[PDB]
Scaffold this motif. Structure first.
Motif, PDB file in Angstrom:
ATOM      1  N   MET A 103       0.825  -1.227   0.000  1.00  0.00           N
ATOM      2  CA  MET A 103       0.000   0.000   0.000  1.00  0.00           C
ATOM      3  C   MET A 103       0.860   1.279   0.000  1.00  0.00           C
ATOM      4  O   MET A 103       0.341   2.362   0.054  1.00  0.00           O
ATOM      5  CB  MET A 103      -0.951   0.018   1.212  1.00  0.00           C
ATOM      6  N   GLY A 104       2.178   1.149  -0.048  1.00  0.00           N
ATOM      7  CA  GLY A 104       3.059   2.295  -0.090  1.00  0.00           C
ATOM      8  C   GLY A 104       3.376   2.938   1.230  1.00  0.00           C
ATOM      9  O   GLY A 104       3.846   4.057   1.244  1.00  0.00           O
ATOM     10  N   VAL A 105       3.132   2.261   2.341  1.00  0.00           N
ATOM     11  CA  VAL A 105       3.543   2.768   3.613  1.00  0.00           C
ATOM     12  C   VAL A 105       5.015   2.442   3.591  1.00  0.00           C
ATOM     13  O   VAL A 105       5.365   1.330   3.290  1.00  0.00           O
ATOM     14  CB  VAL A 105       2.821   2.048   4.772  1.00  0.00           C
ATOM     15  N   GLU A 106       5.872   3.403   3.916  1.00  0.00           N
ATOM     16  CA  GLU A 106       7.327   3.213   3.849  1.00  0.00           C
ATOM     17  C   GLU A 106       7.842   2.482   5.073  1.00  0.00           C
ATOM     18  O   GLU A 106       7.248   2.605   6.128  1.00  0.00           O
ATOM     19  CB  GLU A 106       8.016   4.576   3.745  1.00  0.00           C
ATOM     20  N   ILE A 107       8.968   1.774   4.933  1.00  0.00           N
ATOM     21  CA  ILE A 107       9.552   0.969   6.023  1.00  0.00           C
ATOM     22  C   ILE A 107       9.810   1.753   7.298  1.00  0.00           C
ATOM     23  O   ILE A 107       9.397   1.329   8.389  1.00  0.00           O
ATOM     24  CB  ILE A 107      10.877   0.274   5.607  1.00  0.00           C
ATOM     25  N   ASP A 108      10.495   2.886   7.173  1.00  0.00           N
ATOM     26  CA  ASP A 108      10.800   3.707   8.345  1.00  0.00           C
ATOM     27  C   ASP A 108       9.525   4.166   9.044  1.00  0.00           C
ATOM     28  O   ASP A 108       9.573   4.478  10.198  1.00  0.00           O
ATOM     29  CB  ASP A 108      11.752   4.875   8.012  1.00  0.00           C
ATOM     30  N   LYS A 109       8.384   4.145   8.364  1.00  0.00           N
ATOM     31  CA  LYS A 109       7.098   4.457   8.986  1.00  0.00           C
ATOM     32  C   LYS A 109       6.270   3.210   9.370  1.00  0.00           C
ATOM     33  O   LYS A 109       5.055   3.278   9.524  1.00  0.00           O
ATOM     34  CB  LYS A 109       6.327   5.393   8.054  1.00  0.00           C
ATOM     35  N   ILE A 110       6.944   2.074   9.550  1.00  0.00           N
ATOM     36  CA  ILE A 110       6.325   0.868  10.064  1.00  0.00           C
ATOM     37  C   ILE A 110       7.045   0.446  11.333  1.00  0.00           C
ATOM     38  O   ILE A 110       8.275   0.518  11.425  1.00  0.00           O
ATOM     39  CB  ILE A 110       6.362  -0.256   9.013  1.00  0.00           C
ATOM     40  N   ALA A 111       6.269   0.031  12.327  1.00  0.00           N
ATOM     41  CA  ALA A 111       6.836  -0.540  13.529  1.00  0.00           C
ATOM     42  C   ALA A 111       6.026  -1.766  13.991  1.00  0.00           C
ATOM     43  O   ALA A 111       4.798  -1.838  13.803  1.00  0.00           O
ATOM     44  CB  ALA A 111       6.891   0.517  14.609  1.00  0.00           C
ATOM     45  N   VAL A 112       6.714  -2.737  14.580  1.00  0.00           N
ATOM     46  CA  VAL A 112       6.051  -3.978  14.991  1.00  0.00           C
ATOM     47  C   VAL A 112       6.331  -4.261  16.434  1.00  0.00           C
ATOM     48  O   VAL A 112       7.462  -4.185  16.872  1.00  0.00           O
ATOM     49  CB  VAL A 112       6.512  -5.191  14.160  1.00  0.00           C
ATOM     50  N   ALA A 113       5.275  -4.607  17.157  1.00  0.00           N
ATOM     51  CA  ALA A 113       5.392  -5.152  18.499  1.00  0.00           C
ATOM     52  C   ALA A 113       4.916  -6.575  18.394  1.00  0.00           C
ATOM     53  O   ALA A 113       3.847  -6.832  17.886  1.00  0.00           O
ATOM     54  CB  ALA A 113       4.565  -4.350  19.479  1.00  0.00           C
ATOM     55  N   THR A 114       5.740  -7.508  18.846  1.00  0.00           N
ATOM     56  CA  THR A 114       5.455  -8.922  18.716  1.00  0.00           C
ATOM     57  C   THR A 114       5.986  -9.666  19.960  1.00  0.00           C
ATOM     58  O   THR A 114       6.333  -9.014  20.951  1.00  0.00           O
ATOM     59  CB  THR A 114       6.016  -9.468  17.400  1.00  0.00           C
ATOM     60  N   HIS A 115       6.024 -11.002  19.930  1.00  0.00           N
ATOM     61  CA  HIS A 115       6.562 -11.777  21.064  1.00  0.00           C
ATOM     62  C   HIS A 115       7.851 -12.445  20.636  1.00  0.00           C
ATOM     63  O   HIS A 115       8.293 -12.285  19.469  1.00  0.00           O
ATOM     64  CB  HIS A 115       5.544 -12.803  21.563  1.00  0.00           C
ATOM     65  N   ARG A 116       8.463 -13.160  21.585  1.00  0.00           N
ATOM     66  CA  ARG A 116       9.666 -13.958  21.317  1.00  0.00           C
ATOM     67  C   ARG A 116       9.502 -14.863  20.100  1.00  0.00           C
ATOM     68  O   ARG A 116       8.403 -15.385  19.796  1.00  0.00           O
ATOM     69  CB  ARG A 116      10.036 -14.836  22.507  1.00  0.00           C
ATOM     70  N   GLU A 117      10.614 -15.045  19.405  1.00  0.00           N
ATOM     71  CA  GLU A 117      10.623 -15.918  18.263  1.00  0.00           C
ATOM     72  C   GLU A 117      10.375 -17.348  18.719  1.00  0.00           C
ATOM     73  O   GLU A 117      11.001 -17.849  19.621  1.00  0.00           O
ATOM     74  CB  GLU A 117      11.931 -15.815  17.486  1.00  0.00           C
ATOM     75  N   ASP A 118       9.413 -17.969  18.086  1.00  0.00           N
ATOM     76  CA  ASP A 118       9.060 -19.333  18.347  1.00  0.00           C
ATOM     77  C   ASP A 118       8.630 -19.884  16.981  1.00  0.00           C
ATOM     78  O   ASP A 118       8.800 -19.213  15.951  1.00  0.00           O
ATOM     79  CB  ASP A 118       7.971 -19.449  19.468  1.00  0.00           C
ATOM     80  N   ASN A 119       8.091 -21.092  16.970  1.00  0.00           N
ATOM     81  CA  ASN A 119       7.825 -21.739  15.728  1.00  0.00           C
ATOM     82  C   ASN A 119       6.928 -20.865  14.839  1.00  0.00           C
ATOM     83  O   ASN A 119       7.330 -20.473  13.745  1.00  0.00           O
ATOM     84  CB  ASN A 119       7.175 -23.094  15.946  1.00  0.00           C
ATOM     85  N   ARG A 120       5.745 -20.528  15.346  1.00  0.00           N
ATOM     86  CA  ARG A 120       4.752 -19.819  14.564  1.00  0.00           C
ATOM     87  C   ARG A 120       5.085 -18.373  14.220  1.00  0.00           C
ATOM     88  O   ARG A 120       4.446 -17.822  13.363  1.00  0.00           O
ATOM     89  CB  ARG A 120       3.408 -19.902  15.251  1.00  0.00           C
ATOM     90  N   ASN A 121       6.101 -17.801  14.861  1.00  0.00           N
ATOM     91  CA  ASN A 121       6.510 -16.402  14.697  1.00  0.00           C
ATOM     92  C   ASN A 121       7.846 -16.157  13.942  1.00  0.00           C
ATOM     93  O   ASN A 121       8.311 -15.000  13.873  1.00  0.00           O
ATOM     94  CB  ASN A 121       6.605 -15.749  16.097  1.00  0.00           C
ATOM     95  N   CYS A 122       8.440 -17.216  13.381  1.00  0.00           N
ATOM     96  CA  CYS A 122       9.685 -17.100  12.590  1.00  0.00           C
ATOM     97  C   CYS A 122       9.578 -16.305  11.337  1.00  0.00           C
ATOM     98  O   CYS A 122      10.518 -15.608  10.959  1.00  0.00           O
ATOM     99  CB  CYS A 122      10.185 -18.453  12.133  1.00  0.00           C
TER     100      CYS A 122
END
Ligand SMILES: Nc1nc(=O)c2c([nH]1)NC[C@@H](CNc1ccc(C(=O)N[C@@H](CCC(=O)O)C(=O)O)cc1)N2C=O
Ligand SMILES: Nc1nc(=O)c2c([nH]1)NC[C@@H](CNc1ccc(C(=O)N[C@@H](CCC(=O)O)C(=O)O)cc1)N2C=O
Ligand SMILES: Nc1nc2c(ncn2[C@@H]2O[C@H](COP(=O)(O)OP(=O)(O)O)[C@@H](O)[C@H]2O)c(=O)[nH]1
Ligand SMILES: Nc1nc2c(ncn2[C@@H]2O[C@H](COP(=O)(O)OP(=O)(O)O)[C@@H](O)[C@H]2O)c(=O)[nH]1
Lengths: 248, 252
Positions: free
Chosen positions: B28-47
């Motif tokens: 959709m053209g949202v630029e990388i520097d204008k994206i942020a992610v909050a997630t959990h520890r890396e595990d199987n389903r989150n790789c």
């Protein structure tokens, strides 16, 4: 639903293939009725791999031209083969195992923009429109009856990065429909019109010729934008956007 | 119509839906520097997600949702919008406040029906012929707030928890772009309507068939417990435990 006891081999890589497996489970296709041919775990293919391991889905990473790969197919005995960003040519003898045949995803309106770097070349050449084509495969690359196409508008602000990701996303929204068409034995329609092709190699080896117009330079810059790869280069140095080029 | 230029979007999420969401935002053209992610520890389903974050250099935190580090991460980023895609911790009111255009969460039920956490299994267990998903604005509470988008999904006689869970994701992803544009445009969404219901985190009847249920209830329960690689439904015959087969074989 999909015809019960249908056996689907997905040959694929990354999100598209993870998303395809997801879709298939959603349409009722059992685990023992699914098999995946892929490449080794890497930084784009970790989601697929972690799902294959978690759900105990049979898979191979064998090279597409190896007897091990051919045997993986014959032991599975697929009804259909789906290619989702699989990075190697699948021999004819393998495709022939699938009694209902196959479908590949290509991110151009075939026969326009066969080959690779389609999303990069679309931007350089200044196309206002591109799209994607789901097509039946043969021994050759990017040939075979079209099952489905959708037109994707190219924007003035698009980079290769943004067009690549929009290509994937939009293509996924039509995948379920495409699997049905394959399952129903839709023959699809022949490719036609002006065929074009572009190579492995990076357009102009990633370097900005200063004898181009500002319009073509801006397009080149946008087409070379793909983190974390290095951006376009000027010689006089590194140029990810038109503003930075205007700053120099 | 396209998303506002310079829109800043924080994605709190986990697994494929979040990976797909980020794919959706970049396309959709949202630029990388204008994206942020909050997630959990890396595990199987989150790789999938963790590898994307690393490869494309997208800034992220795995800090706990109630931690000061998490608040500051959001504050510093200063989002226009927040999109929850199978995020697993309650996001506090004060974090959601940071997003000027507000937020959306994807929940796999027709809210307010099936608030809670085994929505898919319970839908099967209760004999619903029809379910769906709900995209909604979040407030401080769980599963509350105005509906931006609901779509129907019919449940089949042959559906299992496994099949339905994956159809919920696939089908929901196909409306994501549209939902991001609703938030872009300030759609308030509409208040929740109808009978609410709720189900808690623990597995329905501990994964155990009660043999005194009817054939049709047992049918349903076996389907709702089918979710590889987890063990299937359990039947006890003469105080002696048995794993049931696949309903295929159960039905003969
Ligand atoms: N038989 C076949 N047809 C296709 O169109 C196709 C495949 N295989 N496999 C993956 C990919 C093409 N990949 C390559 C790789 C190297 C040189 C040529 C093509 N592809 C479709 O993308
Ligand atoms: N404010 C908020 N509302 C929600 O509906 C919501 C969030 N946060 N975050 C993730 C998830 C719910 N997660 C939890 C966690 C612990 C007990 C209950 C719900 N969720 C929405 O799914
Ligand atoms: N800037 C840059 N982009 C690349 C490079 N290799 C691939 N890409 C982009 O990434 C897209 C997909 O990558 P792939 O062909 O799968 O490897 C291509 O269409 C290109 O636009 C590179 O070396 N440099
Ligand atoms: N059979 C079974 N299914 C589970 C178990 N844990 C989670 N699930 C299924 O997976 C879904 C939840 O995934 P989540 O825990 O949100 O990750 C539920 O709707 C369940 O049907 C389990 O221990 N046994």
């Amino acid at each position: 639903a999909i015809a019960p006891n249908t056996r689907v081999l997905v040959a694929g890589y990354g999100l598209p293939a993870e998303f395809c497996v997801t879709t298939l489970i959603g349409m009722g296709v059992e685990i023992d009725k699914i098999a995946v041919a892929t490449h080794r775990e890497d930084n784009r293919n970790c989601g697929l791999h972690s799902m294959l391991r978690l759900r105990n889905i049979q898979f191979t990473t064998a090279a597409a031209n190896s007897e091990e790969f051919y045997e993986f197919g014959a032991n599975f005995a697929p009804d259909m083969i789906i290619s989702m960003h699989y990075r190697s040519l699948i021999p004819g003898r393998f495709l022939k195992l699938a009694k209902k045949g196959s479908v590949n995803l290509h991110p151009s309106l075939l026969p326009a923009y066969r080959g690779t770097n389609s999303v990069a070349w679309v931007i350089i050449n200044g196309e206002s429109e591109t799209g994607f084509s789901y097509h039946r495969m043969d021994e050759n690359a990017d040939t075979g009856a079209i099952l489905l196409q959708e037109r994707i508008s190219v924007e003035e602000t698009d980079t290769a990065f943004s067009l690549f990701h929009r290509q994937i996303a939009r293509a996924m929204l039509r995948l379920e429909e495409v699997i049905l068409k394959l399952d129903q034995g839709d023959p699809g329609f022949a490719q036609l019109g002006e065929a074009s092709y572009y190579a492995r190699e990076l357009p102009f080896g990633g370097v900005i010729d200063p004898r181009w117009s500002e319009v073509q330079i801006d397009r080149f810059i946008r087409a070379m934008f793909f983190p974390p790869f290095p951006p376009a280069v000027l010689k006089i140095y590194y140029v990810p956007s038109i503003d930075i080029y205007r700053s120099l």
